[PDB]
């Protein structure tokens, strides 16, 4: 607002304490944030690992699993679609307190987890059972009786592996499938550069920078200018702040339902 | 700072936040271009002859640029004094057109010519008008004037009762004979020249030696300015938290070499939103950079205040580089030393974090710093977020593992349901008791009865909130 | 005679550097799709009011047209501009000059009364020619290469980069162009706001009309 | 207390207890039938 | 000039209750949302098995 | 706020571009109450009788 101006600062002091609320909202948000993906993605008190040897009754899980060779110890599904999508005047981005390779790290976790012992790892100590098993026991429970899978297996296997083939070819070549995280970068991008823009606006006074009415006018009259601009700019940044409350309440909704609909179809059957 | 802007005496253990920093500048640099378009003044004061008082030369100067400092300090004038014009911030003045009134005149002549004053040649021949003029110079020319000048070159009208008004030459020469009734009662005689002739000597005095005069007289805010006078310049200084003006407009930041490319005839560049990001220079016509001085906030790291004394210091977004220059040196007290230098400069994906030493381990956390790093009190240690335990399990193709035992345990879980129901009285707050305020907040609508609805909006909805989440049986059992 | 002029009479506005950015402006330009009243003053100089602003062209590779006289009363009691050209530099007089009936020029002068200011500077080919004067600044613009791809009609996107300023400080109502003794466009300009791209270089690459058509 | 008040709850706290009660004492002797 | 004065009370005093309010009702909302889950975990863990 | 007059948009224009956003965050509640509606109810592919 000020600018390192010294009479800026004099007549801003006298507005009272709205500083402390304007930046304890932004910490809050901010520290809701981080608890929030803290509590999505760590859902796990052990990190698995799969065997060396891959033998799942038939099926093909090399494109979901990580794969070594990768530089970030990321599988295919998860380069695609980071490749999909893509996006300093007092404001600032703090980064995330947790960075690209523990969440890496953490989904690799849990689909190993998924994948050896079934459901069993989210309600104690993990266990091992093959993966043939674990499907007749998921069978079980739709009201198809166990005879039925292990009599086509193989049909299964086939359909499960052309099946997934076709998903990855369609989200690489799916248009617009990602639409609302552009959408949520988009808007984020779109509040900070309006928000940055408001500095050239007059507000009625007689121009948009401090010093040159400072120095072509006297004080009885460029105090009411200052005036009008600080009132001004503040009522920008209030409207500014209040729109991040609103948007990070709902997206903490959303993450609330995610984190929801992780713990309840990955770690058991719906 | 931390227990002043918490406003308590004891702290607990966690990060905070107290103020912010920036770089101060060093200095400052000039930069105006080479050329500066000369003004011939020379050939106005040093003129090889002037004209007389009754028919002085006039002639127009513009778009010019004039030093009056080269002027003031010369000594050979007589006497430099203006009327309301200030000689020394003649420097910074910018003019729309400038009138230069160049002659000779006599010693004793020299007070007349100023506003509002009586005179033969200030009425006669010259007249000052009732406003604002620049000033007049005289000087000495016995030299030239005196000794070998014309005995009769030099005229002055003797001729009354025709007041002329400012800015007026009659350089017609009449008879001055009425040719009427009052004169004598005769036509023909009472017949005198309006021009006579100075009557000077070689150094025959003080008030009869001609002097050598020029009226300079300045228009301000009537037309587009021409006219300024020249300033200084300096070099410049790079890779410094600089200040300037660079060829004219301001700016402060750091200056770095650029290899864009711009166009012969472009003056300057920006990238968004009215940012400047690239100058150059008249002189040296090479493309640079501007980028602004680094800034940001400090944090303070603490393991509570019962436990310990002790506190990590961190500066968000900051090389170590300007660790040093982040915190001054030598302006703050020797306790903020210990935390300023040596110690240990953690730099780190978030920033410098300094005051406590870095380890190669990796264990479980509590004091979140960010960029997967964080900070725990065994001193203080900053190590590498842990995910836990590891541990892989034998997966095999035809073996299971069956539980024998079982546990039965019991976890608690707290969720609040409801707040406070106040409430804000509406014109009390702003009023007090006071007739006046109520009479001026009439004036401004119904804002009153808006903010006092959503408040008992609030409370039944927060009655009604606990009455559903407790309320679900029709009985009561015992 | 009526022509249409596809898409030309579009310049920088400023003289500030961008980058692969769409800039939205709002000053005076030339609407696309435009009518320009072509001329054949081939055995013709009639009076042209200025408008504030009128666009220029020009066909012919050799020194015909001359100089290019402007003013409000084309007499003496006011000072009257004239830019002329002598094949080897401009000369700029906006001293009074008289009226001229059928003045001749090629490589008339009535008076030079009340004389304050001077200036001197520096298929076939096109020359696109921009005027503009506000508050006392009367500039021009140039473009003296033309793209050998088609014959006939002024078509082709090209920007222009402007040459000269004066503070004249004065008022111009009407203009004269000055022929020699023995085909040039004229189009008007107003104020209608335009969206322009710039390329890595800072140049030019395409602009679109912002009240023409519902998908503009 | 110079324009603002803090309005009292509707319940009080022996309500709260006996509800608390109440489902208890359902939920030890029933189960889920009394639901 | 008493007015002027009062018109600058005024100004200022709504300005920082509008925002009192804003504050308030986001906060609500919140409780609100965290209640209702609330309330659906104790009709659903407690009255049956999950 | 301006009432078909010229100098009440003259002096708003040079406020900066409030009406802008202002515009906005009435059509983004409006365009999502369609979709509010809509995948509440479309929850088959065919129409039975
Ligand atoms: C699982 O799928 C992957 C990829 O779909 C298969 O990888 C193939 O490996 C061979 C041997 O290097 C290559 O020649 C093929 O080009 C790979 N496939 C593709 C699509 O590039 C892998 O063999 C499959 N495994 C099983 C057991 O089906
Ligand atoms: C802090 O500054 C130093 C020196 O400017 C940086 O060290 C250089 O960084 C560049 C990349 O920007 C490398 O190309 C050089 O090899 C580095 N060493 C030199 C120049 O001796 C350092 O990277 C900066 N730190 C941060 C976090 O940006
Ligand atoms: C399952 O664990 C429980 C305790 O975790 C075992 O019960 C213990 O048995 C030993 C030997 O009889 C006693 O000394 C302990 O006092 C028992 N503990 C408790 C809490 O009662 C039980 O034996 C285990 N199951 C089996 C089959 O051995
Ligand atoms: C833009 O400016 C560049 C700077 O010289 C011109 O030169 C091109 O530079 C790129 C970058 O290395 C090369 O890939 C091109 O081959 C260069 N072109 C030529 C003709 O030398 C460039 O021509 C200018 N114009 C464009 C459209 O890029
Ligand atoms: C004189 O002007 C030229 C023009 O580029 C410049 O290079 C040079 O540095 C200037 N000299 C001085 C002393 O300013
Ligand atoms: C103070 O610290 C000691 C040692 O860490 C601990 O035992 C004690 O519980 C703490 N008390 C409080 C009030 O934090
Ligand atoms: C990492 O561990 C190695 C052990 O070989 C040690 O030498 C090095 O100093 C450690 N890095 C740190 C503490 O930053
Ligand atoms: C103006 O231009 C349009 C489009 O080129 C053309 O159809 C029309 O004949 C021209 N003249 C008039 C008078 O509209
Ligand atoms: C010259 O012409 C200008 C404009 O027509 C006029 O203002 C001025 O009085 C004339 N005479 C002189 C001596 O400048
Ligand atoms: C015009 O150009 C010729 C040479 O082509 C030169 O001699 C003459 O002086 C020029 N005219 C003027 C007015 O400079
Ligand atoms: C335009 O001409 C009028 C004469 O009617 C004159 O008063 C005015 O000053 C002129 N405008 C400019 C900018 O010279």
Request: charged share 15%.
């Amino acid at each position: 607002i000020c600018g390192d101006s010294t009479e800026c600062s004099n007549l801003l002091l006298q507005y009272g304490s709205f500083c402390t609320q304007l930046n304890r909202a932004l910490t809050g948000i901010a520290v809701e944030q981080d608890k929030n993906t803290q509590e999505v993605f760590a859902q796990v008190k052990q990190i698995y690992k799969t065997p060396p040897i891959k033998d799942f009754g038939g099926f093909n899980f090399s494109q979901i699993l990580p794969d070594p060779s990768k530089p970030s110890k990321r599988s295919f599904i998860e380069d695609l679609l980071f490749n999909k999508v893509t996006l300093f005047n007092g404001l600032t981005v703090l980064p995330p307190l947790l960075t690209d390779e523990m969440i890496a790290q953490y989904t690799s976790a849990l689909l190993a987890g998924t994948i050896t012992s079934g459901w069993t790892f989210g309600a104690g100590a993990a266990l091992q059972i093959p993966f043939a098993m674990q499907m007749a026991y998921r069978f079980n429970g739709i009201g198809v009786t166990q005879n039925v899978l292990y009599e086509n297996q193989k049909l299964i296997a086939n359909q499960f592996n052309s099946a997934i083939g076709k998903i990855q070819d369609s989200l690489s070549s799916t248009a617009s499938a990602l639409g609302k995280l552009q959408d949520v970068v988009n808007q984020n991008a779109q509040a900070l550069n309006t928000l940055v823009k408001q500095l050239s606006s007059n507000f009625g006074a007689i121009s948009s920078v401090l010093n040159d009415i400072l120095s072509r006018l006297d004080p009885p009259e460029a105090e009411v200018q200052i005036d009008r601009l600080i009132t001004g700019r503040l009522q920008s940044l209030q409207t500014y702040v209040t729109q991040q409350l609103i948007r990070a309440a709902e997206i903490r909704a959303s993450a609330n339902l995610a984190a929801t609909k992780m713990s309840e179809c990955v770690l058991g059957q719906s | 700072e931390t227990k002043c802007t918490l406003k308590s005496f004891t702290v607990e253990k966690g990060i905070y936040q107290t103020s912010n920093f920036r770089v101060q500048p060093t200095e400052s640099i000039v930069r105006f271009p080479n050329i500066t378009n000369l003004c011939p003044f020379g050939e106005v004061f040093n003129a090889t002859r002037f004209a007389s008082v009754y028919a002085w030369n006039r002639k127009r100067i513009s778009n010019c640029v004039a030093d009056y400092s080269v002027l003031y300090n010369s000594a050979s004038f007589s006497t430099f004094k203006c009327y309301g014009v200030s000689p020394t911030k003649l420097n910074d003045l910018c003019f729309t057109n400038v009138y230069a009134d160049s002659f000779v005149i006599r010693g004793d002549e020299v007070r007349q010519i100023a506003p509002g004053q009586t005179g033969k040649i200030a009425d006669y021949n010259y007249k000052l008008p009732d406003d604002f003029t620049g000033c007049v110079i005289a000087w000495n020319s016995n030299n030239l004037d005196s000794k070998v000048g014309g005995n009769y070159n030099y005229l002055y009208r003797l001729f009354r009762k025709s007041n002329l008004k400012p800015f007026e030459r009659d350089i017609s020469t009449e008879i001055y004979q009425a040719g009427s009734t009052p004169c004598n009662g005769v036509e023909g005689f009472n017949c005198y020249f309006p021009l006579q002739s100075y009557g000077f000597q070689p150094t025959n005095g003080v008030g009869y030696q001609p002097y050598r005069v020029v009226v300079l007289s300045f228009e301000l805010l009537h037309a587009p300015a021409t006219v300024c006078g020249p300033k200084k310049s300096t070099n410049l200084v790079k890779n410094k938290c600089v200040n300037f003006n660079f060829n004219g407009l301001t700016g402060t930041g750091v200056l770095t070499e650029s290899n864009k490319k711009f166009l012969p005839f472009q003056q300057f560049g920006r990238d968004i939103a009215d940012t400047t990001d690239a100058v150059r220079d008249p002189q040296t016509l090479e493309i640079l950079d501007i980028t602004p001085c680094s800034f940001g906030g400090v944090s303070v790291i603490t393991p509570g205040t019962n436990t310990s004394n002790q506190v990590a210091v961190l500066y968000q977004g900051v090389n170590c580089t300007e660790v040093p220059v982040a915190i001054h040196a030598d302006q703050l007290t020797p306790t903020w030393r210990v935390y300023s230098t040596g110690s240990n400069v953690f730099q780190t994906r978030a920033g410098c974090l300094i005051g406590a030493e870095h380890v190669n381990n990796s264990y479980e956390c509590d004091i979140p710093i960010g960029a997967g790093i964080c900070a725990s009190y065994q001193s203080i240690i900053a190590y590498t977020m842990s995910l836990g335990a590891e541990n892989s399990v034998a997966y095999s193709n035809n073996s299971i593992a069956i539980p024998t035992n079982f546990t039965i345990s019991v976890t608690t879980e707290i969720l609040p349901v409801s707040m406070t129901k106040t409430s804000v009285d509406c014109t009390m707050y702003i009023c007090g008791d006071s007739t006046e305020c109520s009479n001026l907040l009439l004036q401004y609508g119904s804002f009153c009865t808006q903010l006092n609805r959503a408040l008992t909006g609030i409370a039944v909805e927060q009655d009604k909130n606990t009455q559903e989440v407790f309320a679900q049986v029709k009985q009561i059992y015992k | 005679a009526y022509t249409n002029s596809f898409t030309r009479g579009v310049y920088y506005p400023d003289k500030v550097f961008r980058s692969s950015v769409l800039h939205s402006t709002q000053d005076l330009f030339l609407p696309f799709f435009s009518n320009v009243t072509w001329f054949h003053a081939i055995h013709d100089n009639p009076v042209l009011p200025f408008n504030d602003g009128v666009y220029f062209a020009s066909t012919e590779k050799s020194n015909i047209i001359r100089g290019w006289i402007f003013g409000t009363t084309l007499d003496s009691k006011t000072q009257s501009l004239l830019i002329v050209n002598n094949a080897t530099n401009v000369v700029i007089k906006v001293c009074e000059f008289q009226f001229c009936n059928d003045p001749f020029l090629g490589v008339v002068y009535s008076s030079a009364n009340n004389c304050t200011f001077e200036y001197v500077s520096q298929f076939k080919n096109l020359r696109e020619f921009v005027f503009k004067n506000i508050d006392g600044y009367f500039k021009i613009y140039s473009k003296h290469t033309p793209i050998n791809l088609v014959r006939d009609l002024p078509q082709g996107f090209s920007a222009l980069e402007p040459l000269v300023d004066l503070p004249i400080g004065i008022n111009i109502t009407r203009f004269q162009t000055l022929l020699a003794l023995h085909a040039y466009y004229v189009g008007y300009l107003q104020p209608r706001t335009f969206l322009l791209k710039y390329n890595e270089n800072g140049t030019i690459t395409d602009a679109v009309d912002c009240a023409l058509d519902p998908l503009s």
